[PDB]
Amino acid sequence: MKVEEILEKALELVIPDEEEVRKGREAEEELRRRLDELGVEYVFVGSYARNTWLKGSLEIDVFLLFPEEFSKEELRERGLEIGKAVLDSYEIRYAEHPYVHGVVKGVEVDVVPCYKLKEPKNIKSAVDRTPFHHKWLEGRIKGKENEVRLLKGFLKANGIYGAEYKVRGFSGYLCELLIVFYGSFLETVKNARRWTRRTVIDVAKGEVRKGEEFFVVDPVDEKRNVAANLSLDNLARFVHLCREFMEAPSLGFFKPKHPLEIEPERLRKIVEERGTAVFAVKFRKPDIVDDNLYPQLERASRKIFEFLERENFMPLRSAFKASEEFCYLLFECQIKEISRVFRRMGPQFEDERNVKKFLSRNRAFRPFIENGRWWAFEMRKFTTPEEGVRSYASTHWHTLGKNVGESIREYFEIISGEKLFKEPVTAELCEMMGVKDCCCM
Amino acid sequence: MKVEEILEKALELVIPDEEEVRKGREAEEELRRRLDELGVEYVFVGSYARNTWLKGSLEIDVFLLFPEEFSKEELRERGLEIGKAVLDSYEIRYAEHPYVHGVVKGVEVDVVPCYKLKEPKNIKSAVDRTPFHHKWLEGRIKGKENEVRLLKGFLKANGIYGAEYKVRGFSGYLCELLIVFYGSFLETVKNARRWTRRTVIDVAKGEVRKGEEFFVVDPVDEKRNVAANLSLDNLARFVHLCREFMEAPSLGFFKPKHPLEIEPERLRKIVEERGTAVFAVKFRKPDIVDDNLYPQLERASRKIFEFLERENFMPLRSAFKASEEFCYLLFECQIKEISRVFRRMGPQFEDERNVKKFLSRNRAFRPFIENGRWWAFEMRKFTTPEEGVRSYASTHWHTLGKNVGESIREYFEIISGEKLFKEPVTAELCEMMGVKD
RNA sequence: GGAAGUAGAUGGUUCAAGUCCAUUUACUUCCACC
RNA sequence: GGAAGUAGAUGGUUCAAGUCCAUUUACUUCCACC
Numbered sequence A: 001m002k003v004e005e006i007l008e009k010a011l012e013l014v015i016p017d018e019e020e021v022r023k024g025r026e027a028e029e030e031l032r033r034r035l036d037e038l039g040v041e042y043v044f045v046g047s048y049a050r051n052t053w054l055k056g057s058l059e060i061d062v063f064l065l066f067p068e069e070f071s072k073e074e075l076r077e078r079g080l081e082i083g084k085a086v087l088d089s090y091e092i093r094y095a096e097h098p099y100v101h102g103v104v105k106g107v108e109v110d111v112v113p114c115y116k117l118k119e120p121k122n123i124k125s126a127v128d129r130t131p132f133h134h135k136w137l138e139g140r141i142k143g144k145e146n147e148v149r150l151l152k153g154f155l156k157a158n159g160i161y162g163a164e165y166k167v168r169g170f171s172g173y174l175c176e177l178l179i180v181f182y183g184s185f186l187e188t189v190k191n192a193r194r195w196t197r198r199t200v201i202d203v204a205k206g207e208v209r210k211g212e213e214f215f216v217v218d219p220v221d222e223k224r225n226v227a228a229n230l231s232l233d234n235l236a237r238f239v240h241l242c243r244e245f246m247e248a249p250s251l252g253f254f255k256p257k258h259p260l261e262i263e264p265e266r267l268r269k270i271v272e273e274r275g276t277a278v279f280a281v282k283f284r285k286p287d288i289v290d291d292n293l294y295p296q297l298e299r300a301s302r303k304i305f306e307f308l309e310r311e312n313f314m315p316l317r318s319a320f321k322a323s324e325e326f327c328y329l330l331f332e333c334q335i336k337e338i339s340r341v342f343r344r345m346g347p348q349f350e351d352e353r354n355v356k357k358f359l360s361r362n363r364a365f366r367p368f369i370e371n372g373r374w375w376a377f378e379m380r381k382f383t384t385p386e387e388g389v390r391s392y393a394s395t396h397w398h399t400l401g402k403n404v405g406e407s408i409r410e411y412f413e414i415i416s417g418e419k420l421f422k423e424p425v426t427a428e429l430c431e432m433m434g435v436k437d438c439c440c441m
Numbered sequence B: 001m002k003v004e005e006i007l008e009k010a011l012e013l014v015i016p017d018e019e020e021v022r023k024g025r026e027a028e029e030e031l032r033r034r035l036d037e038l039g040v041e042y043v044f045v046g047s048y049a050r051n052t053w054l055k056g057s058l059e060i061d062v063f064l065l066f067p068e069e070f071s072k073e074e075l076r077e078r079g080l081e082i083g084k085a086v087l088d089s090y091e092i093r094y095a096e097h098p099y100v101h102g103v104v105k106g107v108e109v110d111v112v113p114c115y116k117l118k119e120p121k122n123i124k125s126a127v128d129r130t131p132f133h134h135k136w137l138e139g140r141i142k143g144k145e146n147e148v149r150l151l152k153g154f155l156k157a158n159g160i161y162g163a164e165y166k167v168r169g170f171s172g173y174l175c176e177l178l179i180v181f182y183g184s185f186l187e188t189v190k191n192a193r194r195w196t197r198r199t200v201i202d203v204a205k206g207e208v209r210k211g212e213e214f215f216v217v218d219p220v221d222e223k224r225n226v227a228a229n230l231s232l233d234n235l236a237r238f239v240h241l242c243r244e245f246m247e248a249p250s251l252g253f254f255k256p257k258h259p260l261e262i263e264p265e266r267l268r269k270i271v272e273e274r275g276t277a278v279f280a281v282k283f284r285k286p287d288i289v290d291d292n293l294y295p296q297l298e299r300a301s302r303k304i305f306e307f308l309e310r311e312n313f314m315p316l317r318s319a320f321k322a323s324e325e326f327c328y329l330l331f332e333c334q335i336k337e338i339s340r341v342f343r344r345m346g347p348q349f350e351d352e353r354n355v356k357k358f359l360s361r362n363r364a365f366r367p368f369i370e371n372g373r374w375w376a377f378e379m380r381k382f383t384t385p386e387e388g389v390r391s392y393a394s395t396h397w398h399t400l401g402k403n404v405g406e407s408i409r410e411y412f413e414i415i416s417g418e419k420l421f422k423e424p425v426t427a428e429l430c431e432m433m434g435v436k437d
Numbered sequence C, D: 001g002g003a004a005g006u007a008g009a010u011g012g013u014u015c016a017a018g019u020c021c022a023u024u025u026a027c028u029u030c031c032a033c034c
């Protein structure tokens, strides 16, 4: 179909209906009656206050403005007090900046404490720009909300919406800025296509520039990269998505895909067809927030992956999963088994004193001469990748992030092959190996 | 036994006995008589003519002299004809410069044609320097001819004596030059220790030097490297050898130990203990002289070894063997079997046009992005180093040396596992695998 | 918590470490959690 | 026959390989067979 019609149909996927808006307005009225009764300085920020929220994804943001003089400790104490005071029921978990998550009249709320500033240049808390963002966006976003919703739909469906470490994709606010910078979803997509990894997009200045890295300049604070946590890979995924959408437009880009329930039998065959070593490390999930788990999970992966590569097991790709009570670290290797013996470089034949030291050692085989250098044969303490990481992880748990490294210490195991296939990691496995035709809807 | 007491014993193995020399002088008188009777300018050279041959292996060198006017061909025709005429039973097989190998009274003989030059500069024939070697070295070795004999046995018990491509070792002449430079086998051994690949020995002026690479100058032709064919590794073996002898001297350094008969069962265990892929390419041996063969076996093997590495089989070492009718290229590999899928590198996402082509190629698995750029899983054609070289040797036979290549082109088998060990390549596997029993 | 940078200092590995594998002190950043 | 080198001519691989795998024509050495 023509791109214009594909977008009209996409709007039914991304615009909240009056069921949900009603439910939000009267959630807003209640929240206000409560906060007013409490006589506190507050301000509605975020997608709800600018009507740029997606269908079925409503969350109201209430900011409480405290005096700049307040300590970090007082900011916490009162923040949570009011937040608790104001919600039908609540929940407190945060990685660094304190807030309370909760519900009023069946709708989700974040009540967040912050400092009231005259300038967002220099910032006490980490969220101090948010009420300035809104003030910047408030007038400039009007009548473009649906463009925003389209871009947020396109992103979510394609798994790259959100700046959190779990996603490392596009923040909601980044979406709003882009729509402001580019006019419309379509125009964002059409331009997105020629973003290099060095595209600097200075919204306030209306400029596109070449810099050291991809960088969206926060209108509100110039030092701030709005896309600071957008992975170079997700940037790439996005520009590819754009190029692909404009060749062949489709409502598909706006509907999300889901892993297909794949038989432990079919992927037995797939793995053996590939003939690779695939195994995971299974360990108990440290009870910490998402934004803390995921970097350490990434870290754990890199470290073993690198261990695997300097040990010549020739790793391909790595992935991870965090279930309810377990985390897995998945790997695939080209080498299932390596020989016991390997080569070690020795001193040049002339360097007498070091040659002395080099054959000093007790070795099963005699060292030889090659291209005018001594060389030895020595044994490996392991010959398969599973054996390797079993050893690596046992002795190097410390280096695997503070919390997983500790959970791995208390207990970890290796699962490989069919045993591993009855674990809730198949989706990653499929994804990791580039398995075709295993996603749907 | 002290230092000099080891050269004493060795003398019986290096100096020719009563019988051996006496069979020479008469086999020499017999030779002058036929050659004179033919009326040729000829002159005796080499180890026998300088009383510098090792006991047991004697070879008389006779040089036919000719005017410079003779064509490349003319030199060759008379050279062979006079040769055939002079010897008893005789043999011709050479790689470039025509000589004739034979037997007289019972001993082995070489008769080589060459041109009578004024000076060994712009040397016409290949071997023209030999008379001019003799003319300089005769009167400078008169009495120290037992210092070469000690050096020769030493190097020949170590299989690193002989400049020919099967040995890449020390030339007989070079050893003679090491005595005239140093004065004694022992002193030669002393300095050897601080020899480097950077060494330039100048016999002409008697001066050690750190020039280009290793270079023993010929005082007869300054531009010759008398050490031209000594390998870097074979150098390395001699200099380590001399370090070992100096610190712990033995007669064992003169005994030629006979390549261990390690049973086919024993190393099947060692190879399985090492857990490595160890196979050989077996093919019919081309009917060519050694000097054209061994360089081709070197090349053949080098090329396959380099294939192996670039194919991620992680080879350790290689070796080769020439038998009656067969040749063997041996390899050992860390990887017995590699996965079927591998990674091909794509282009950076920004490059729309190359990304589009890279994605258009039919594969079995979705390509992915990693660290900015596209990557693709691809299926290998072979999963074992054996399947590997079968495929390589099949297609690249021509790059594997002129003749060995032709031979591989006709036929070869890849032998490994149980079948390999019952073939005449065990000696070479031990050496290659660094075995001690 | 993660990442980055600066000035360190230890361990282990190697014939050989400022470089490889870990550890740790000090300091300046940044990101995520809104 | 092998190797080092100067001046080009292709062919395969690959998204791209003037850089990977090969091939080829000249002129230039050099080594082994003594």
Ligand SMILES: Nc1ncnc2c1ncn2[C@@H]1O[C@H](COP(=O)(O)OP(=O)(O)OP(=O)(O)O)[C@@H](O)[C@H]1O
Binding pocket: A045, A046, A047, A048, A052, A053, A054, A059, A061, A110, A129, A130, A131, A133, A134, A152, A163, A171, A172, A173, A226, C034
């Ligand atoms: N990573 C971030 N970078 C910049 N601003 C942020 C970030 N996270 C939150 N904010 C600010 O806080 C506001 C509320 O953010 P929140 O995480 O509640 O999502 P949102 O912007 O409301 O959009 P949506 O609800 O559609 O995901 C944002 O509009 C923005 O001003």
Ligand SMILES: Nc1ncnc2c1ncn2[C@@H]1O[C@H](COP(=O)(O)OP(=O)(O)OP(=O)(O)O)[C@@H](O)[C@H]1O
Binding pocket: B045, B046, B047, B048, B052, B053, B054, B059, B061, B110, B129, B130, B133, B134, B163, B171, B172, B173, B226, D034
């Ligand atoms: N590669 C070489 N380089 C220089 N000179 C050589 C070479 N090969 C042979 N010659 C010359 O030809 C002569 C005869 O060589 P031949 O191959 O018969 O052995 P040799 O040097 O006489 O010693 P032996 O016969 O004891 O091994 C030598 O004395 C030497 O002068």
Ligand SMILES: [Mn+2]
Binding pocket: A046, A047, A048, A058, A059, A060, A061
């Ligand atoms: Mn929100």
